[PDB]
């Protein structure tokens, strides 16, 4: 009821009308504990536990910290564009622990948590690089039950290559019996990237919801896509047309304008 959730897929305007309405909605929006990942916690409202996570474009690593501390993840692969100074003392398997993950170091010492860090200058750390997957695949666990991709990009930028890294993992390196949830940070100002998800990733799942956390900025087109129920028969067609996908994006932005105009966005 207070939760902003729009089904990604489940008598409609033309793509030209949708694109024009979206441009107007984006113009209107534009004019309108630091370690806690509040946004990801709101996205994961229906879930309470995961065992093996693959967290991509993690930045400081607050999403990985949430999955370990609150969701009880025992094995986690953490990719981030942030490298660390060589003088920091805490390491996990020779790689420098991100500052945000220092509270979980005792779990690694007691053998209760396996963290696989992909934050080194000696590795490829940009998931949009064409050789990232080959560089890291022998270190990525192939039994993940949750995959997250939290990259921040500028508005309007095509994010297809970030989504492509997740598609590569799903099509080459997961156990279809164990993958339960895929979470992507998306930008609704990036229509090419949204349509890429509709063509590539969304047809692999039985459920998909766009969620706008209360802790996500009222002016940003940032939303999260929560995909679940990986299908046991691989579809050879999309769940919906590009026109239906554009209409969903327009509906989500209309609901966001409505929320922001009434004045409600939590941060401090």
């Amino acid at each position: 009821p207070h939760r902003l959730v729009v089904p990604f897929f489940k008598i409609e305007p033309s793509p030209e009308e949708s694109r024009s309405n979206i441009k107007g909605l984006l113009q209107h929006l534009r004019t309108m504990v630091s370690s806690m990942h509040y946004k990801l916690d709101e996205v994961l409202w229906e879930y309470n536990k995961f065992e093996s996570a693959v967290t991509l474009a993690e930045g400081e690593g607050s999403g990985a910290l949430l999955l370990i501390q609150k969701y009880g993840v025992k094995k986690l692969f953490l990719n981030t564009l942030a490298t660390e100074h060589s003088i920091e003392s805490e390491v996990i398997s020779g790689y420098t622990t991100p500052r945000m993950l220092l509270p979980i170091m005792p779990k690694t010492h007691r053998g209760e948590l396996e963290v696989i860090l992909n934050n080194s200058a000696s590795q490829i750390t940009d998931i949009t690089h064409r050789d990232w997957f080959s560089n890291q695949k022998n270190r990525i666990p192939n039994d993940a039950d949750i995959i997250t991709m939290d990259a921040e990009t500028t508005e309007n930028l095509d994010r297809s290559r970030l989504y492509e890294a997740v598609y590569t993992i799903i099509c080459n390196h997961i156990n279809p019996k164990t993958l339960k949830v895929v979470i992507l940070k998306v930008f609704l100002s990036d229509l090419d990237g949204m349509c890429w998800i509709n063509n590539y990733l969304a047809p692999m799942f039985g459920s998909g919801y766009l969620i706008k956390p209360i802790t996500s900025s009222a002016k940003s087109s940032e939303w999260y896509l929560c995909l679940s129920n990986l299908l046991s028969t691989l579809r050879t067609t999309q769940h919906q047309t590009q026109a239906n996908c554009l209409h969903v994006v327009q509906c989500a932005l209309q609901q966001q304008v409505q929320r922001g105009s009434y004045w409600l966005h939590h941060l401090t």
């Epitope: 064409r130 997957f133 080959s134 695949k137 590569t168 799903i170 099509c171 080459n172 390196h173 997961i174 156990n175 279809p176 063509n199 590539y200 047809p203 692999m204 990986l230 299908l231 046991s232 028969t233 691989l234 579809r235 050879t236």
Partner: nanobody, 122 residues
Framework: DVQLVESGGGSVQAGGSLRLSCAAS????????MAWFRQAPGKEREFVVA????????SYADSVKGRFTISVDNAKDTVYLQMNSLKPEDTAVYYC???????????????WGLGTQVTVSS
């Protein structure tokens, strides 16, 4: 680039079986939907079934239901097609194809093997 090599074809008596293999090399992860197609003389290329390298299968063509099975050995970069209860109508050149997306049209796959002949005698 992806390179594909099919093997396991040949002549077989009606009612018999064959097991085709498709050894893939190159950037296999970038075209992770591996499909089997077949083309009978004078006929168009027919989609048989496809699987991701992770093991997710599409549904099978009605003409092969209950007889053919696709499988993968991801560690060996090989895809297999088990072909049982073969009949003369199954005679065709069988091809392995690698694509970015699961699609039934041959033109949606940009990498192909040279094919392996399968001949089922009456």
């Amino acid at each position: 680039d992806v390179q594909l090599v099919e093997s396991g074809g040949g002549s077989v008596q009606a009612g018999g079986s064959l097991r085709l293999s498709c050894a893939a090399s190159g950037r296999t992860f970038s075209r992770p939907v591996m499909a089997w197609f077949r083309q009978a003389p004078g006929k168009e290329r027919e989609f048989v079934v496809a699987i991701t390298w992770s093991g997710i299968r599409t549904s099978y063509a009605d003409s092969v239901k209950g007889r053919f099975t696709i499988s993968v050995d991801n560690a060996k970069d090989t895809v297999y097609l088990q072909m049982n209860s073969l009949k003369p109508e199954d005679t065709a050149v069988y091809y392995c194809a690698a694509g970015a997306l699961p699609r039934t049209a041959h033109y949606e796959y940009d990498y192909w093997g040279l094919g392996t002949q399968v001949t089922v005698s009456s």
